[PDB]
């Protein structure tokens, strides 16, 4: 019984005797501590998790129409994560939106970083500015920073929330090439007690003519923000009717507009011949989510600045977001004079995207950017482009490719299956928007059909490749044969994604006619149970559509419901009563041992242990990356991760299995069972919507 499924997993998570949250109340990344794959930490937590936990308890609201559990995570997500009697960001009111930053270059490897402050372009003018002071009387950004380390693992305390364990941090600063495994994870509140004397930790990713001031800075992820507008937007269709609470979600989509402008409010497509143009009224906001926004000034104290971002990743879109901030029927539209007919504009500029990136398979591609290369680059010749931005098929990061993840295609496509589902269910079955929602999912659900399996096992090669009968790689095409074999029980999802191509220019919907020079090979078959959840939801949203719009289920939204039936009842068989537990290994674990995390030379500093860093086991950063300074490894910068309950494991594992002639690992690979809250909240969450739009179909 799926709403019983529901409530069992639900009880998981929420027993304190499981581990998923910290004696503060807030849920951790997951349950294990050793792992390391956007957050570093397995107790670290992002806005990522405690956007799924108000999602998983807007579902829990439906059922019982006890919505206090709403309501406290809403709480207690904005004492720790939304940093808004102490004030958090004490300059904010010195922003200036006539010159809202000063302008550095991204550069390709983190070795070239500290990036001069140059002000080599002059940044735009920030129209939502004097908006937002106008609605709420004060410009303070009601927005989650992504980062928290809840257990303070890092040791740097909570400067400015002394009575709070959690404390801001952030890892990610110097480029595309900075994978999770070379960051210097610091305090958002740096009063330099840590980091370099007179400095802290700011002098690693930029440089000026003086030595930093102490600072203040936070950067939200829009994706998670958008999903926290999300689960209100289902709250309020499932009866939830607080008007304290629906202005709270309301004032974070208003500032989540920040995410649809360029990152130094330059002028939409001015950067294509390498000279960008100092943004205007709202020609510098391309009307999508991108990576981030960021904000933060001094800790005498006297300036501020923003950032929006240049670089689009369509996984981070959320169309059902976008609806509920911008209609009636969503409940969401906030309160700033033009926050509604923005959210209009980015929620048809978002199917938008979709559509220019449908390749030719099924998935979807990259993304676009605004600043070819972080430097406002002039475009290659002959790239595709989308609105006058390029395309990148690995938008924000190459390491690895940001779009390579088969997570960044149930995530967003889950959402294009529910608008697909909320149009339908309200009569519109015609607009050009309600067309591409529909186009989109149809062609990416017949896709996914041909990679998901359940009760066999895809055969594969060891570099991941699913194999045919005749044991060919099958790469891409419209109708793969793939072999299988019996795994009674079990469910297989791809992980990876090898693409090649771009789509076409995009010339609106009207003149699209596909993209047959853009593929993509599908690979490495895996039991991700936050992808397999995710991807049970738009299997049931896309089914529930084609049930809305035609009357019945189509022969696609058959198989796709009969498939989600069989993938629930699959994975209700690895719950080990924590949550859905599936093995997984990791090629990539050898990076806890590699010599690559870059300091400059020169700099030496404290960290919250107070232990110096990078301290004496360094070696010579890479002449070929333009840097001047070393590279120390993982356990070097976080020697505490050796006390680590599982960190015999590894380092045995390292020891006796990696092989540095082959780069692989050939003596069994590192093999863990993960708990990731947003992952069983994916899985909770499919089993509720199971029950909800399929029920006894
Ligand atoms: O020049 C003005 C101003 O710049 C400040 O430096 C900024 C950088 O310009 C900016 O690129 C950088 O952005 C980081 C961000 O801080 C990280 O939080 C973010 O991490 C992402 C992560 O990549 C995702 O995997 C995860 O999902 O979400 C987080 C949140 O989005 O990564 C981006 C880069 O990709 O942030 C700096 C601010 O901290 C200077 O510090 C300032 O002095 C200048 O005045
Ligand atoms: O950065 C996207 C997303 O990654 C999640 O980790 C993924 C990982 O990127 C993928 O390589 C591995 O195979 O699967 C894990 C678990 O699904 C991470 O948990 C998210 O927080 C993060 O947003
Ligand atoms: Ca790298």
């Keep these: 019984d799926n709403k019983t499924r529901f409530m069992q997993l639900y009880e ?225 269709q499932w009866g939830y009717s607080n008007t304290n609470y629906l202005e709270k979600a309301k004032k974070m989509g208003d500032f989540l507009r920040y995410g649809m402008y360029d990152k130094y409010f330059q002028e939409i497509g001015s950067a294509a011949d390498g000279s960008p143009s100092r943004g205007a009224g709202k020609n510098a906001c391309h009307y999508l989510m991108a990576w981030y926004t960021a904000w933060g000034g001094g800790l005498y104290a006297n300036w501020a600045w923003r950032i929006g971002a240049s670089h689009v990743h369509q996984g981070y879109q959320n169309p059902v977001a976008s609806y509920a901030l911008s209609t009636a029927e969503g409940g969401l539209i906030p309160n700033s004079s033009t926050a509604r007919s923005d959210w209009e504009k980015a929620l048809k500029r978002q199917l938008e995207l979709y559509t220019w990136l449908l390749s030719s398979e099924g998935a979807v591609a990259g993304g676009a ?160 149970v936050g992808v397999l959840g995710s991807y049970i939801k738009t299997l049931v949203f896309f089914a529930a559509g084609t049930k809305a719009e035609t009357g019945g289920f189509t022969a696609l939204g058959n198989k796709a419901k009969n498939l989600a039936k069989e993938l629930l009842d699959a994975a209700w068989s690895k719950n080990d009563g924590i949550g859905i537990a599936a093995e997984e290994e990791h090629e990539d674990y050898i990076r806890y041992f590699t010599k690559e995390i870059y300091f400059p030379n020169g700099w030496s500093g404290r960290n919250g242990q107070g232990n110096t860093i990078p301290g004496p086991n360094t070696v010579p950063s890479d002449p070929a990356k333009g840097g001047n300074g070393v590279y120390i490894s993982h356990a070097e910068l976080r020697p505490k991760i050796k006390n680590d309950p599982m960190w015999p494991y590894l380092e045995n594992k390292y020891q006796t299995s990696w092989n540095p002639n082959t780069g692989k690992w050939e003596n069994g690979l590192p093999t863990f069972v993960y708990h990731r809250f947003w992952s069983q909240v994916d899985m909770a969450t499919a089993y509720a919507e199971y029950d909800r739009l399929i029920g006894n179909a």
Excluded at 468 to 475: H, I, Q, T
Excluded at 505 to 512: A, L, Q
Aim: charged letters at 20%; glycine letters at 6%; hydrophobic letters at 30%.
């Design 12 to 236: 998981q998570i929420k027993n304190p005797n499981n581990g998923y949250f910290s004696p503060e109340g807030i849920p951790y990344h997951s349950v294990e501590t050793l792992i390391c794959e956007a957050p570093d930490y397995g107790h670290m937590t992002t806005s990522e998790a405690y956007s799924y936990w108000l999602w998983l308890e807007a579902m829990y609201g439906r059922y019982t129409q006890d919505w206090s559990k709403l309501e406290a995570a809403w709480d207690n997500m904005e004492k720790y994560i939304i940093p808004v009697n102490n004030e958090e960001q004490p300059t904010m009111n010195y922003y200036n939106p006539s010159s809202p930053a000063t302008y550095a270059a991204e550069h390709p490897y983190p070795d070239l970083y500290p990036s001069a402050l140059t002000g080599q372009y002059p940044a735009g003018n920030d129209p939502l500015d004097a908006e937002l002071k106008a609605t709420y009387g004060s410009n303070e950004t009601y927005l989650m920073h992504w980062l928290l380390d809840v257990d303070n693992w890092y040791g740097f305390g909570n400067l400015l929330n002394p009575s709070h364990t959690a404390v801001y941090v952030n890892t990610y600063q110097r480029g595309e090439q900075e994978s999770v495994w070379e960051t210097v994870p610091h305090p958002s509140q740096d009063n330099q007690t840590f980091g370099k004397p007179n400095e802290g930790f700011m002098s690693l990713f930029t440089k000026e003519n003086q030595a930093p001031a102490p600072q203040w800075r936070y950067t939200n992820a829009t994706d998670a923000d958008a999903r926290a507008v999300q689960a209100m937007f289902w709250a309020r």
């Design 369 to 528: 950017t605004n600043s070819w290369n972080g430097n406002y680059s002039a475009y290659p010749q002959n790239v595709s482009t989308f609105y006058e931005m390029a395309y990148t098929e690995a938008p924000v990061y190459h390491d690895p490719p940001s779009n390579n993840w088969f997570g960044m295609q149930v995530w967003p496509l889950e959402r294009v299956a529910e608008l697909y589902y909320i149009f339908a269910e309200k009569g519109d079955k015609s607009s050009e928007s309600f067309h591409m929602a529909k186009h989109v999912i149809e062609k990416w659900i017949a896709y996914s059909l041909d990679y998901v399996f359940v009760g066999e096992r895809p055969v594969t090669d060891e570099e991941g490749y699913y194999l045919n009968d005749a044991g060919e790689r099958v790469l891409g095409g419209q109708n793969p044969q793939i072999a299988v074999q019996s795994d009674p029980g079990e469910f297989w999802i791809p992980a990876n994604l090898e693409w090649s191509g771009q789509p076409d220019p995009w010339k609106g919907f009207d003149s699209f006619t596909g993209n047959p020079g853009l593929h993509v090979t599908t690979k490495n078959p895996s039991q991700d």
